[PDB]
Design a protein around this ligand. Structure first.
Ligand SMILES: COc1ncc(-c2cc(-c3ncc(CN4C[C@@H](C)O[C@@H](C)C4)o3)c3cn[nH]c3c2)cc1NS(C)(=O)=O
Length: 858
């Protein structure tokens, strides 16, 4: 009964019935399902037996300040679970949670006149009405929650949770090739269901690829007249022996009409998932184009009824099955050869290119010196993997002999190896091996890219999937975001099977978390139906009329139940308790997004949270932009610079659907600049508006801190939008917080899409200068923040480039070519010394001040 129940709940949550994986009768899907179910159920068993602190590390992973992972006194209100009563203690920032625990326990002993059996060690500190905890040996200032409280001046509210109450949570949450010298060849039989102009002819272009690099030149078929069912029945002979074909070789096709006109493409892996070379007839269910697409999926289009179908024939090269030689035979072949006997002058020339795109002779020097590359320049592995002739088996074996004895490389170097430019399974396997040392916070930071890399994968059962599942089942937040990255792409036919299969495997490993996520999905189901109603309604009547009707709809028990008592998909730590129907509304833009507010008596002031549900637009690019700004913030803070950034949440959840985090106490620059009457912010000059509003919100001494907050966030956003090429910036997509904090919203365009200049808006220069026409003391202190922030990002120039290259797998239109990646290389001026790039930045900063000074004049 329960086995049947779990499957039906998995089918509903993943957004595809489990029976549909079975109907494929594909042994690759069936072997993935049994192997990963077993792998996931082991993690489940390991977890259900963890210690109580180890359970806190899984369920409530520490949220530490970027400064700690690698005095000033304060009031903290502490209480005990089974009591409404609480005590406020004066503590220090330098103090550990345990000192506060033993403190909380002394006052409870005096209040109850009993010398308490318990020790501070037995308890943990929960943030009031949040799935957040404060434990480990870290001062209060090192926790993201205490640090936050110190800037908004607020008192931290904590609850003492006993070890027995945590274990209660743990318990309630239970579950031979190299002797085939003949040239490679296929028989292109015919084409099916093709749709093209009857005037033209159909040509099939096939190509053999090892990622982006061609194994041999391309070949085109004979020009056969346009008709629905074209016929060829001709041999295609490639310029490569069947002995020379690498394990990860993909045969690519491109059907196209000509008098050029793309129609469809399709790719397949020449070797199956059991290392066996493929034989027999092959029907290719084609994907529609807009010619050769090597990066595209190697699985056929699921829509067999409408899609084009080319019939090929991989012939029997031998009378018995042929497998790719095992590692033991590979390492034995590559074990033989001559080392690099190079003179001091060529060793200097080698050091020049290995520390530096290179000429043909320069690739010959890397290859000869492949042992000195391994020995003295191991971090130059990727450059050596690029010089390898992946169309020669002896060359691949010599290379794969060095890779098996290659020392582990840093996380930075491992991320580059994950690229499609490195298609070898042993190279990919080596990348995950060097990525294991990634901490949970770093893995969280790069989890979006690692999920997109799943789209480059040639087979279902892979190291990257087992790695992502392993880390996801060891950490409930990683698991949370892994699920939503997969769930949000189920509508895309090319990944739906892969992604469907990963979530099922996850769900097997966490039955309780599937139930938690089903609750998020039920809430998002209601929000879609309500948002649709608002779209239709706003077209038929006034905003108060639609708002009231949204409120009536929300007040239905079905809605009240589905929309309340959940974990936020934006942040699993945030609990969305009682839905505040009176505060819910909708935005007046094209997609009419929903503004949903929540309150929690258990969480108090911190439990006033809201989420925005937006349906109609792809939100993935916003998310990427936001994650990139957040990374900058993390990087700046690791160098001691806090630019008071607002890296608010944005998470795609489904088809052109997702969530945006509400920042309360903020309004857009435009709304403030409206300069309305009978308000505190009303101005004598419109340039006074932002400043007047910062004054109204910040009385007395407080105003100076708001001007500083503005200056810091501004400098951070001026740099963030310049490096990322964020354009279409106006007063409607620029916001200000009551604390003085400036931040940007709605990122529709990045990376030029051409050559976006640095912008200094005189409205924000007027606040920086404290309303003074000239204030060089304050203006140049802001230029210093821009510079420092700019020169810190350049030091991690290789990281953003490594991350943005991986994001090319996402299929975002503004991230589709090397022109987009080049944009970042120019914005960070990576091909320059720190001096040159700085002088250049100043040229562009002064170019922006001259442009700002246009308004200043009037
Ligand atoms: C990807 O697109 C977006 N990305 C972000 C936001 C957005 C937009 C806002 C926002 N825009 C205006 C206001 C302030 N208003 C909100 C209104 C409900 O109540 C007023 C008191 C102040 O807040 C916001 C506030 N916190 N978080 C926010 C996020 C909106 C959108 N979509 S859009 C431009 O609304 O179509």
């Amino acid at each position: 009964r329960v086995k049947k129940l779990i499957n039906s709940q998995i089918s509903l949550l993943i957004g595809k019935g489990l029976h549909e994986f079975d109907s494929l009768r594909d042994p690759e899907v069936n072997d993935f399902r049994t192997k990963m179910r077993q792998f996931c159920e082991e993690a489940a068993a390991h977890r259900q037996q963890l210690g109580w602190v180890e359970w806190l590390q899984y369920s409530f992973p520490l949220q530490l300040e970027p400064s700690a992972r690698g005095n000033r006194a304060l009031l903290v209100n502490v209480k005990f679970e089974g009591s409404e009563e609480s005590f406020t203690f004066q503590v220090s920032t330098k103090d550990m949670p345990l000192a506060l625990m033993a403190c909380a326990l002394r006052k409870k002993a005096t209040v109850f006149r009993q010398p308490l059996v318990e020790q501070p060690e037995e308890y943990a500190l929960q943030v009031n009405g949040r799935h957040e905890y404060l434990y480990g040996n870290y001062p209060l200032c090192h926790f993201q929650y205490i640090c936050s409280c110190l800037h908004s001046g607020l008192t931290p509210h904590l609850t003492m949770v006993h070890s027995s109450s945590i274990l209660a949570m743990r318990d309630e949450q239970s579950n031979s090739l190299w002797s085939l010298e003949q040239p490679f060849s296929i028989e292109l039989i015919e084409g099916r269901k093709v749709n093209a102009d009857e005037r033209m002819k159909l040509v099939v272009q096939a190509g053999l690829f090892h990622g982006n690099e061609m194994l041999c030149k391309t070949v085109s078929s004979s020009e056969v007249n346009v008709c629905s069912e074209p016929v060829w029945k001709q041999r295609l002979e490639f310029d490569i022996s069947v002995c020379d074909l690498p394990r990860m070789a993909r045969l690519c096709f491109a059907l196209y009409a000509v008098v050029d006109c793309p129609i469809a493409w399709a790719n397949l892996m020449l070797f199956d998932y059991k290392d066996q070379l493929k034989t027999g007839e092959r029907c290719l269910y084609m994907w529609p184009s807009v010619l050769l697409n090597p990066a595209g999926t190697v699985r056929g289009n699921p829509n067999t009824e409408s899609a084009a179908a080319l019939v090929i024939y991989l012939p029997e090269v031998a009378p018995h099955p042929v497998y790719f030689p095992a590692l033991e035979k590979i390492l034995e072949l590559g074990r033989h050869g001559e080392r690099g006997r190079i003179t001091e002058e060529e060793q200097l020339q080698l050091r020049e290119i290995l520390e530096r795109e290179l000429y043909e002779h320069e690739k010959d020097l890397v290859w000869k010196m492949r042992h000195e590359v391994q020995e003295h320049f191991p971090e130059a592995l990727a450059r050596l993997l690029l010089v390898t002739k992946w169309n020669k088996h002896e060359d691949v074996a010599q290379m794969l002999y060095l890779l098996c004895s290659w020392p582990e490389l840093p996380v930075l170097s491992a991320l580059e190896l994950l690229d499609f430019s490195f298609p070898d399974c042993y190279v990919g396997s080596f990348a995950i091996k060097s990525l294991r040392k990634l901490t949970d916070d770093e893995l969280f930071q790069y989890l979006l890219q690692l999920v997109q890399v799943l789209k480059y994968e040639s087979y279902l059962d892979c190291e990257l999937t087992k790695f992502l599942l392993g880390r996801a089942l060891a950490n409930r937040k990683i698991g949370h975001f892994l699920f939503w990255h997969l769930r949000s792409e189920m509508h895309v036919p090319s990944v739906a099977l892969r992604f469907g299969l990963i979530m099922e495997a996850y769900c097997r490993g966490s039955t309780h978390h599937m139930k938690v996520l089903m609750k998020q999905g039920e809430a998002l189901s209601k929000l879609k139906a309500l948002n649709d109603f608002v779209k239709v309604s706003s077209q038929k009547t006034t905003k108060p009329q639609t708002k009231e009707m949204m409120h009536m709809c929300m007040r239905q028990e079905t809605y009240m139940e589905a929309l309340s008592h959940l974990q936020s998909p934006l942040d699993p730590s945030t609990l969305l308790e009682e839905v505040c129907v009176e505060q819910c509304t909708f935005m007046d833009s094209k997609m009419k997004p929903l503004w949903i507010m929540y309150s929690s008596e258990e969480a108090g002031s911190a439990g006033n949270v809201g989420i925005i549900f937006k349906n109609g637009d792809d939100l993935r690019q916003d998310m990427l932009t936001l994650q990139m700004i957040q990374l900058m913030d993390v990087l700046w803070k690791q160098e001691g610079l806090d630019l008071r950034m607002t890296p608010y949440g944005c998470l795609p959840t489904g088809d052109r659907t997702g969530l945006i985090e509400v920042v309360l106490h903020s309004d857009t620059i435009a709304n403030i600049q409206l300069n309305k009457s009978n308000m505190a912010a009303t101005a004598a000059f419109n340039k006074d508006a932002l400043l007047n509003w910062l004054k109204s919100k910040n009385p007395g001494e407080a105003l100076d801190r708001a001007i500083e907050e503005f200056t810091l966030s501004c400098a951070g956003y001026c740099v963030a939008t310049y490096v990322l090429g964020i354009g279409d910036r106006h007063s409607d997509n620029i916001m200000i917080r009551e604390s003085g904090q400036l931040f940007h919203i709605d990122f529709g365009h990045f990376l030029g899409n051409e050559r976006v200049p640095f912008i200094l808006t005189y409205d924000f220069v007027h606040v920086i200068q404290q309303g003074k026409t000239n204030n060089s003391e304050k203006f140049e202190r802001f230029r210093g923040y821009c510079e420092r922030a700019y020169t810190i990002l350049r030091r991690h120039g290789l990281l953003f480039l490594h991350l943005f290259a991986l994001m090319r797998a996402a299929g975002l239109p503004e991230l589709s070519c090397s022109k987009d990646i080049q944009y970042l290389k120019d914005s960070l001026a990576l091909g320059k010394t720190e001096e040159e790039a700085l002088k250049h930045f100043r040229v562009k900063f002064n170019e922006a001040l001259r442009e700002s000074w246009k308004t200043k004049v009037n």
